[PDB]
C-alpha cells in the first residue's frame, strides 16, 4: 500500500499549481442562496444587532438590493417575512394571506427579476402568537396534521404568488407529501419543494428569531417534540428517506456547520440534491469574531467550502453577497 517515503503527501501540496490540480471541491456562485428578512412598509431598513451586517428590508428596498444580488449571479433568495405583531394569531391565518409580506414580496421579485429563484418559507412560526411552527392543542402540543392543513394553504398561496420553490421548515411529519399532493392537484406541477428534512432543535437559531421577530413570541419555549435531537444521526436518514418518497425535489439539513457529518451521510446515502443552512448563529459567530479581529475574513470562504466538501449542492447563507463578490474577483 501507500507508504512513506515512496508516498509523501506533501508533494502535491508543494506548489499552488498542484494544489489546484488536485483540489477536490470548489465553491461557486451556483452554490449560494441568500436568505433575506422582509419588512412591511416602504423605505424601511433595520439593522439586526445579533447579525452584524444584515438588514431587514422593506420590499422596495429588497428590490433595489436584489439588483446587485442578480448582477453577482446569486441563483436564489430565501424569503423570511417579519410579520407585524398584530398579525400573529393562534390560527396563523396570515401564513396564507395573499397580501402577506412573503406573498407580496414574491410577486414583486418574480416580475422584476424573472430569472431569480425565490424560495419561500412554509411554516407557521412567523405567524403564531406563541412562536411554535404549528398550531397548538389544549395541552400546548404542536398538532401535526392540523398544522399541515395550514401549511398546505400557505404553500399554495406561495405557488399562486409565483414562487418557484417552497421550503417547508416546519418539521411536521408527512408535510412534504401533503404539500406535494396539494400542489399537484392544483396544477403547480413544477413548483419545487425544498424540504427541511433534518432540522435540529438547536441553540444556533437565536439570532434568526430576533431577525424575524418570533423570539419574543417563543420566549423560553422549545421545539423538541418536532425538531430533531442534536444527538441523533441515523434518524436524519429516515427523515430524508421519507421526504424523498413524499416528493421533495431537494432536501436540507439545518443547522449547517455543527451538522456537516449529517450533510455527508445524507449526500452519500441518497445521492439527491442536498442543501444546508448556515444559520443565523453561525453567521453571527463568525462575524463577531471577524469584527473583533480574531479571525481573518478568509474564514468566510473556508466555512462555505466546508459545506461543498461535506456534500452540499447548495448553501443558504447570510454571507452570500460577500462570498459572491469575492468569487467574482
Residues within window 116-135 making contact with Zn ion, judged by CB under 5 A: 123, 125, 133
Which one, of 204, 236, 109, lies nearest residue 163 by Cα?
Answer: 109
Helix (H) or strand (E) holding 177: helix 175-185
Binding mask 20-49 for a second copy (x = CB under 8 A): xxxxxxx-x-xx-x----------------
Size of the site for Mg ion (CB under 5 A): 1
Q: Which of 107, 192, 199, 254 binds a second copy (CB under 8 A)?
A: 192
In 208-325, where do the E strands start and end? 250-254, 274-278, 314-317
> Do residues 157 and 98 make contact, with C-beta atoms less than 8 angstroms apart?
yes
Alpha carbon distance 95, 101 (integer Å) = 9
Q: Which of 99, 138, 189, 219 binds a second copy (CB under 8 A)?
A: 189
Regarding 302 and contact with K ion (CB under 5 A), the answer is no
4 exposure class (CB count in 10 Å sphere: 0-12, 13-18, 19+): exposed
Active-site annotation holds for 199: yes
Alpha carbon distance 307, 309 (integer Å) = 5
Region for residue 169 given its phi and psi (left: phi exceeds 0; alpha: psi -120 to 50; beta: otherwise): alpha
Contacts of 121 (CB under 8 A, 6+ apart): 78, 79, 80, 81, 102, 167, 169
The alpha carbon torsion through 60, 61, 67, 68 (nearest 10 deg) reads 180
DSSP H helical segments within 48-116, as ranges? 59-71, 101-112
Size of the site for a second copy (CB under 8 A): 114
Alpha carbon distance 164, 125 (integer Å) = 22
Cell 392540523 sits on residue: 146
The entry of K ion, Zn ion, Mg ion, none near residue 94 (CB within 5 to 8 angstroms by kind) is: none
Q: Is 280 annotated as a binding residue?
A: yes
Work out how close the CB of 131 gets to Zn ion at its nearest, in angstroms, rounded to a whole number.
8
The entry of Zn ion, K ion, Mg ion, none near residue 31 (CB within 5 to 8 angstroms by kind) is: K ion
Q: Which of 14, 45, 112, 328 binds a second copy (CB under 8 A)?
A: 14
Q: Which residue is nearest to Mg ion (CB)?
A: 239
Q: Is 202 annotated as a binding residue?
A: no
User: For residues 133-152, which are near Zn ion according to CB under 5 A?
Assistant: 133
Q: Which of 60, 65, 173, 313 binds K ion (CB under 5 A)?
A: 313
Work out how close the CB of 81 gets to a second copy at its nearest, in angstroms, rounded to a whole number.
21
Binding mask 15-34 for K ion (x = CB under 5 A): ---------------xx---
In the set 88, 199, 267, 308, the catalytic residue is 199
Alpha carbon distance 236, 265 (integer Å) = 9
Nearer of residues 31 and 239 to Mg ion, judged by Cβ: 239
Q: Is 269 annotated as a binding residue?
A: no
Q: Is 283 annotated as a binding residue?
A: no
Tell me the DSSP string of 313-324: SEEEETTHHHHH
Regarding 239 and contact with Mg ion (CB under 5 A), the answer is yes
Nearer of residues 12 and 225 to K ion, judged by Cβ: 12
Q: Which of 110, 136, 215, 288 binds a second copy (CB under 8 A)?
A: 288
In this structure, the strands spanning 314-317 and 55-58 are unpaired
Q: Is 318 annotated as a binding residue?
A: yes
Active-site annotation holds for 321: no
Largest Cα–Cα separation, the chain: 71
> Do residues 279 and 254 make contact, with C-beta atoms less than 8 angstroms apart?
yes
Q: Which of 163, 303, 320, 327 binds a second copy (CB under 8 A)?
A: 303
List the binding residues for Mg(2+).
239
List the binding residues for 5-aminolevulinate.
209, 223, 280, 318
Active-site residue set: 199, 254
Per CB under 5 A, residues contacting Zn ion are 123, 125, 133
Amino acid at each position: 500500500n501507500r507508504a512513506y517515503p515512496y508516498t509523501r503527501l506533501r508533494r502535491n501540496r508543494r506548489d499552488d499549481f498542484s494544489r489546484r490540480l488536485v483540489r477536490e471541491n470548489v465553491l461557486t456562485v451556483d452554490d449560494l442562496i441568500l436568505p433575506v428578512f422582509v419588512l412591511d412598509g416602504v423605505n424601511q431598513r433595520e439593522s439586526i444587532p445579533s447579525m452584524p451586517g444584515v438588514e431587514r428590508l422593506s420590499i422596495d428596498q429588497l428590490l433595489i438590493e436584489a439588483e446587485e444580488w442578480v448582477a453577482l449571479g446569486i441563483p436564489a433568495l430565501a424569503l423570511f417575512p417579519v410579520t407585524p405583531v398584530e398579525k400573529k394569531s393562534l390560527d396563523a391565518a396570515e401564513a396564507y394571506n395573499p397580501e402577506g409580506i412573503a406573498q407580496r414580496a414574491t410577486r414583486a421579485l418574480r416580475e422584476r427579476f424573472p430569472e431569480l429563484g425565490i424560495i419561500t418559507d412554509v411554516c407557521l412560526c412567523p405567524f403564531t402568537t406563541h412562536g411554535q411552527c404549528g398550531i397548538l392543542d389544549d395541552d400546548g402540543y404542536v398538532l401535526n396534521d392540523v398544522s399541515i392543513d395550514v401549511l398546505v394553504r400557505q404553500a399554495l398561496s406561495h405557488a399562486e404568488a409565483g414562487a418557484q420553490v417552497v421550503a417547508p421548515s416546519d418539521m411536521m411529519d408527512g408535510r412534504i407529501g401533503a404539500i406535494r399532493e396539494a400542489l399537484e392537484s392544483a396544477g403547480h406541477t413544477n413548483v419545487r419543494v425544498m424540504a427541511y428534512s433534518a432540522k435540529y432543535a438547536s441553540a444556533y437559531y437565536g439570532p434568526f428569531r430576533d431577525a424575524v421577530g418570533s423570539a419574543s413570541n417563543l420566549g423560553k419555549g422549545n421545539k423538541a417534540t418536532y425538531q430533531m435531537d442534536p444527538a441523533n444521526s441515523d434518524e436524519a436518514l429516515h427523515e430524508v428517506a421519507a421526504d424523498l418518497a413524499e416528493g421533495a425535489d431537494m432536501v436540507m439539513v439545518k443547522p449547517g456547520m455543527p451538522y456537516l457529518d449529517i450533510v455527508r451521510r445524507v449526500k452519500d446515502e441518497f445521492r439527491a440534491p442536498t442543501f444546508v443552512y448556515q444559520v443565523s448563529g453561525e453567521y453571527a459567530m463568525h462575524m463577531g469574531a471577524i469584527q473583533n479581529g480574531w479571525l481573518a475574513e478568509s474564514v468566510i470562504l473556508e466555512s462555505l467550502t466546508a459545506f461543498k466538501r461535506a456534500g452540499a449542492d447548495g448553501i443558504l447563507t447570510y454571507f452570500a453577497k460577500q462570498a459572491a463578490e469575492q468569487l467574482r474577483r
